[PDB]
Design a protein around this motif. Structure first.
Motif, short mmCIF file in Angstrom:
data_model
loop_
_atom_site.label_atom_id
_atom_site.label_comp_id
_atom_site.label_asym_id
_atom_site.label_seq_id
_atom_site.Cartn_x
_atom_site.Cartn_y
_atom_site.Cartn_z
N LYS A 195 0.86 -1.17 0.00
CA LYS A 195 0.00 0.00 0.00
C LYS A 195 0.90 1.23 0.00
CE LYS A 195 -3.24 1.53 3.22
NZ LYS A 195 -3.88 2.80 2.80
N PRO A 196 0.77 2.12 -0.98
CA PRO A 196 1.55 3.37 -0.95
C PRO A 196 0.95 4.35 0.03
CG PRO A 196 0.15 3.29 -2.91
CD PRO A 196 -0.10 2.01 -2.16
N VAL A 197 1.80 4.99 0.83
CA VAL A 197 1.36 5.95 1.84
C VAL A 197 2.09 7.27 1.62
CG1 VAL A 197 1.26 6.43 4.29
CG2 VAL A 197 0.77 4.12 3.42
N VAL A 198 1.33 8.37 1.56
CA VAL A 198 1.96 9.67 1.41
C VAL A 198 2.43 10.15 2.77
CG1 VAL A 198 1.72 12.08 0.77
CG2 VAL A 198 0.69 10.26 -0.66
N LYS A 199 3.73 10.55 2.85
CA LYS A 199 4.37 10.94 4.13
C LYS A 199 4.97 12.35 4.05
CE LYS A 199 5.25 8.32 7.21
NZ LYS A 199 4.48 8.31 8.49
N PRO A 200 4.89 13.15 5.11
CA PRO A 200 5.37 14.54 4.99
C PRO A 200 6.86 14.69 5.25
CG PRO A 200 4.36 14.17 7.16
CD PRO A 200 4.12 12.91 6.36
#
Ligand SMILES: CC(=O)N[C@@H]1[C@@H](O)[C@H](O[C@@H]2O[C@H](CO)[C@@H](O[C@@H]3O[C@H](CO)[C@@H](O[C@@H]4O[C@H](CO)[C@@H](O[C@@H]5O[C@H](CO)[C@@H](O[C@@H]6O[C@H](CO)[C@@H](O)[C@H](O)[C@H]6NC(C)=O)[C@H](O)[C@H]5NC(C)=O)[C@H](O)[C@H]4NC(C)=O)[C@H](O)[C@H]3NC(C)=O)[C@H](O)[C@H]2NC(C)=O)[C@@H](CO)O[C@H]1O
Ligand SMILES: CC(=O)N[C@@H]1[C@@H](O)[C@H](O[C@@H]2O[C@H](CO)[C@@H](O[C@@H]3O[C@H](CO)[C@@H](O[C@@H]4O[C@H](CO)[C@@H](O[C@@H]5O[C@H](CO)[C@@H](O[C@@H]6O[C@H](CO)[C@@H](O)[C@H](O)[C@H]6NC(C)=O)[C@H](O)[C@H]5NC(C)=O)[C@H](O)[C@H]4NC(C)=O)[C@H](O)[C@H]3NC(C)=O)[C@H](O)[C@H]2NC(C)=O)[C@@H](CO)O[C@H]1O
Ligand SMILES: [Cl-]
Ligand SMILES: [Cl-]
Lengths: 79, 77
Positions: free
Chosen positions: A46-51
């Motif tokens: 699962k791709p997760v957007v991270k800051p």
């Protein structure tokens, strides 16, 4: 269906466990990156957007794979 | 019984997510530090020894919690 740059062999080999493993640029933005969460043994993730922290931009260079000062980042928007 | 500086309340409140969270000095070594890896969602974590870049030493000061020049570090030696 969603954008997903998690390469299966990278997922299988590293299990996304190490400090530079399974981290990719986010096409939408230079101040975030994509981190892959393994979903099974066969390399799906699962791709997760991270800051990134304030002021920093993704550095996708080999040996980096971290948030960095803009003049060292791989942001396509420059000068 | 072995050494574990990972305080559960800090694990609980931060999930060890942030850039300075759950990071401790390594008592045995100024050129490494201990980072806590959570083992559950209720505050328990294990300590992982992590390296400083070559020539740098741990700086445990408030607001620092990073590897730093030796003259700026908190090394007891
Ligand atoms: C119970 C169990 O086991 N569950 C499993 C679970 O653990 C698994 O999930 C995985 O867990 C692991 C362990 O927690 C996670 O690993 C973490 O991954 C992150 C990245 O995603 C790592 O973060 C990096 O941390 C390093 C430091 O260790 C950072 O390095 C620093 O980078 C900065 C720049 O950004 C450098 O700055 C420069 O410094 C010089 C001076 O040295 C200065 O002159 C410059 O000015 C300065 N530049 C700037 C811009 O300031 C700095 O030097 C360097 N520091 C050092 C010491 O070299 C790096 O930035 C971080 N990268 C990102 C991105 O944040 C983190 O280290 C790592 N933790 C550990 C303990 O290793 C992993 O993410 C996680 N994976 C997933 C998918 O969630 C899961 C999944 O496998 O399974 C469960 O079962
Ligand atoms: C899919 C998912 O959600 N998975 C989860 C997984 O992500 C979670 O794991 C956690 O992930 C996060 C990232 O997502 C990890 O966060 C990273 O944490 C590391 C520390 O562990 C942070 O590393 C620091 O990075 C900063 C840059 O941003 C470095 O800052 C620089 O430091 C240098 C000194 O080293 C400074 O230079 C000094 O400046 C002073 C003052 O000006 C000057 O006097 C000195 O001369 C000078 N010294 C030198 C030598 O130059 C410099 O100014 C500063 N730069 C800036 C811009 O402030 C710092 O060095 C790094 N510290 C260490 C230690 O490496 C990193 O920033 C952070 N990444 C992000 C993106 O936030 C987190 O580690 C990780 N946790 C764990 C436990 O693995 C896990 C667990 O929560 O859950 C999964 O589910
Ligand atoms: Cl951006
Ligand atoms: Cl910002």
């Amino acid at each position: 269906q969603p954008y997903n740059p998690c390469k299966p062999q990278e997922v299988i080999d590293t299990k996304c466990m190490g400090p530079k493993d399974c981290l990719y640029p986010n096409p939408d933005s230079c101040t975030t990156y994509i981190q892959c969460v393994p979903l099974d043994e066969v390399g799906n993730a699962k791709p997760v957007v991270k800051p990134c922290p304030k002021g920093l931009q993704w550095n996708d260079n080999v040996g980096k794979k971290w948030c960095d000062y803009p003049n060292l980042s791989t942001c396509p928007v420059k000068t």
